[PDB]
Amino acid sequence: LICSISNEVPEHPCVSPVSNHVYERRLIEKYIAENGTDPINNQPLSEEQLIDIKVAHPIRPKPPSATSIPAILKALQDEWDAVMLHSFTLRQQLQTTRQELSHALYQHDAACRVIARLTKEVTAAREALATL
């Protein structure tokens, strides 16, 4: 909603047929009279290139309505992407603490095994201590 030279709000935004960039009437017409080209990349252009007049036509412009056609669908996509984004950062902890419980479970099982061996050793040991 600004010009392509002077940054003012155009009353008839000008559109040139090389690198079309919404401009202002007086700015673009002046840049033409100064040199027959646009501001963007120094290509060729003519006076006829601008189709100035707004495009109001059977297109039936509605001053952008709140709840009619496109807004609900766009907002829905944006919010569903966010739902999935957060559920991802939750499934992160899901898998991570899975790995933690895996290591801890292997640890606790094979660790009670350490006692399963130690008890046999000490129980035979005190028995021998009484015996001999």
């Binding site: 898998q95 899975r98 790995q99 895996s102 290591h103 292997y106």
Partner: protein, 50 residues
């Protein structure tokens, strides 16, 4: 309302079979991948756990 619905329900039901047999295809197609996504996230488990 029905003048075209009686065709849009009819020519849809031309596909309710040929697309419907493939409708038994894409169902069990990704369904077995729920074991391939389990035994992947289970192959995500056994790798570093040992």
């Amino acid at each position: 309302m029905t003048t075209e619905a009686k065709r849009a329900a009819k020519m849809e039901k031309k596909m309710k079979i040929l697309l419907g047999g493939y409708q038994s295809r894409a169902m069990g197609l990704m369904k077995q991948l729920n074991d391939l996504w389990d035994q992947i996230e289970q192959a995500h488990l056994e790798l570093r756990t040992f």
